[PDB]
Amino acid sequence: KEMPQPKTFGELKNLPLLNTDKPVQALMKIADELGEIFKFEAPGRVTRYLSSQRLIKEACDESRFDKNLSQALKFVRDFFGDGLVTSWTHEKNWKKAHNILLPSFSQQAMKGYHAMMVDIAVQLVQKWERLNADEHIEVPEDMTRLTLDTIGLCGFNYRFNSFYRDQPHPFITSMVRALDEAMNKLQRANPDDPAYDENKRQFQEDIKVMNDLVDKIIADRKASSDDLLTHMLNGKDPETGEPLDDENIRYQIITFLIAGHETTSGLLSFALYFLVKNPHVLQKAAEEAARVLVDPVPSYKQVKQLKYVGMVLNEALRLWPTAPAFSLYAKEDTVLGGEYPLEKGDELMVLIPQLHRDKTIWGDDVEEFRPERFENPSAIPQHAFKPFGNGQRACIGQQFALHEATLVLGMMLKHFDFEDHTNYELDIKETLTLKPEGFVVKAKSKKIPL
Ligand code: HEM
Numbered sequence: 001k002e003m004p005q006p007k008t009f010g011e012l013k014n015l016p017l018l019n020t021d022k023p024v025q026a027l028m029k030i031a032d033e034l035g036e037i038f039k040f041e042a043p044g045r046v047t048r049y050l051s052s053q054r055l056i057k058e059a060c061d062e063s064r065f066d067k068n069l070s071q072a073l074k075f076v077r078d079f080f081g082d083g084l085v086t087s088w089t090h091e092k093n094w095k096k097a098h099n100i101l102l103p104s105f106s107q108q109a110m111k112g113y114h115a116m117m118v119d120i121a122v123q124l125v126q127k128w129e130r131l132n133a134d135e136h137i138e139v140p141e142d143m144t145r146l147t148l149d150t151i152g153l154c155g156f157n158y159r160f161n162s163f164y165r166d167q168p169h170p171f172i173t174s175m176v177r178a179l180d181e182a183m184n185k186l187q188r189a190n191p192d193d194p195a196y197d198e199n200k201r202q203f204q205e206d207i208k209v210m211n212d213l214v215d216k217i218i219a220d221r222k223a224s225s226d227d228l229l230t231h232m233l234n235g236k237d238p239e240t241g242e243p244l245d246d247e248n249i250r251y252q253i254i255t256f257l258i259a260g261h262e263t264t265s266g267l268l269s270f271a272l273y274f275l276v277k278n279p280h281v282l283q284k285a286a287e288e289a290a291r292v293l294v295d296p297v298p299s300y301k302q303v304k305q306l307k308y309v310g311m312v313l314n315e316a317l318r319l320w321p322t323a324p325a326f327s328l329y330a331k332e333d334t335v336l337g338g339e340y341p342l343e344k345g346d347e348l349m350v351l352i353p354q355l356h357r358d359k360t361i362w363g364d365d366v367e368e369f370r371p372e373r374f375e376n377p378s379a380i381p382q383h384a385f386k387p388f389g390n391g392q393r394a395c396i397g398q399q400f401a402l403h404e405a406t407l408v409l410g411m412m413l414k415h416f417d418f419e420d421h422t423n424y425e426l427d428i429k430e431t432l433t434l435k436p437e438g439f440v441v442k443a444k445s446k447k448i449p450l
């Protein structure tokens with residue numbers, strides 16, 4: 001069969017469809033209109049967007065498709081380098097770093113992060129305990145303070161001290177502009193117009209901000225642990241017997257500082273959004289939190305008991321996966337779905353939020369927030385739920401993100417009652433990644449000591 005395609009703009013083909021602040025949301029609306037697969041063309045480029053589990057389960061066959069660097073990741077590569085997220089699977093530094101950093105995410109490593117997660121989580125609970133009557137909380141701003149600080153502390157023993165700042169941390173401000181710039185570049189017909197010279201200068205300034213922080217983290221450790229940074233600096237790949245070089249290490253630090261907090265901040269923001277909009281769900285989560293979290297701070301085993309809270313998070317990831325796309329390329333000529341022939345090298349994009357609204361898998365209520373969908377995870381078919389990517393190139397931090405988010409959300413629900421005092425209208429800001437923008441709540445302390 002011939003694949004559908006959205007409206008075209010003469011010689012710019014589909015490119016002007018990305019001239020929006022919300023490209024993923026626009027792509028979802030295209031997919032709603034066109035179905036499980038469509039072609040998207042730009043001058044000199046083609047990609048195919050997949051939205052059904054039927055086709056995406058094929059794309060996830062690593063004997064047929066490998067991770068591709070999308071245009072997005074190519075642009076992020078300018079500051080992520082050949083770090084884990086932006087390396088090709090065949091590049092020597094992908095498997096080497098993977099092997100070197102994997103032990104940083106064992107169950108024993110996670111047990112050793114727990115105390116540091118608690119330290120930051122207590123700082124968030126205390127900020128909110130200390131607000132006066134009728135003050136409110138800027139949700140994604142505070143989630144970002146927590147998640148950036150958690151990855152800085154757990155991974156690098158470095159204190160961002162985000163909660164000691166009224167504005168976002170300068171590292172964040174530069175990160176958000178660089179990510180914005182990467183997204184904005186997706187739409188540029190003429191990337192080397194002189195009209196973009198100033199964006200290029202800002203982009204370079206933002207990269208310098210990020211990098212001087214990296215230098216500071218490296219300086220501090222050399223001056224001063226058994227954490228991510230220890231492994232980056234000293235660990236050896238069991239295959240080659242080599243450690244990472246200096247250049248790749250700096251890319252890993254930037255990589256992990258960003259991937260290791262931005263998407264988790266989004267997830268916690270979306271989860272709280274859905275909880276305040278679904279009071280019976282919030283009540284059931286609050287009741288588990290109270291039942292499980294019996295000590296003044298949570299223990300590692302207790303965080304593992306928060307099953308319903310785990311489900312809430314997975315359901316937030318189902319509706320709004322915070323890294324909403326990943327890309328694949330055909331390793332050889334092959335036919336997708338028995339209907340769409342692909343040549344070696346052809347690129348696919350998995351549109352995760354659409355996968356996650358596939359009614360053949362989830363039933364007709366796909367827009368409802370129902371954590372009970374995850375009551376028995378066995379029943380979900382393969383490759384239906386992919387907020388953490390696929391196969392050997394799946395998220396290395398998945399358990400880190402979920403443990404942190406489960407810990408923090410468990411504590412929030414134990415310690416406060418929440419009010420959507422503005423009747424907030426969901427507004428999703430895109431910076432490649434997804435977050436609610438302007439989401440505010442009020443939290444009334446239950447006065448449970450901490
Ligand atoms: C809820 C939060 C998170 C989400 C939704 C998320 C999502 C993803 C996705 C979709 C990919 C695959 C990208 C692709 O195929 O191009 C990925 C990879 C990756 N993630 Fe996460 N992630 C989260 C949290 C984290 C955390 C906390 C860390 C680090 C501590 C992390 C580190 C990475 C790294 C290093 C990779 C590349 C792995 C590799 O290819 O070797 N992520 N993640």
Ligand SMILES: COc1ccc2nc(SCc3ncc(C)c(OC)c3C)[nH]c2c1
Nearest residue numbers: 023070072085258259323324325432433
């Ligand atoms: C049209 O092309 C697009 C648009 C938006 C997109 N958002 C993304 S999300 C891409 C992504 N995935 C995973 C991680 C770990 C990561 O670092 C935080 C990033 C930036 N990719 C896109 C591709």
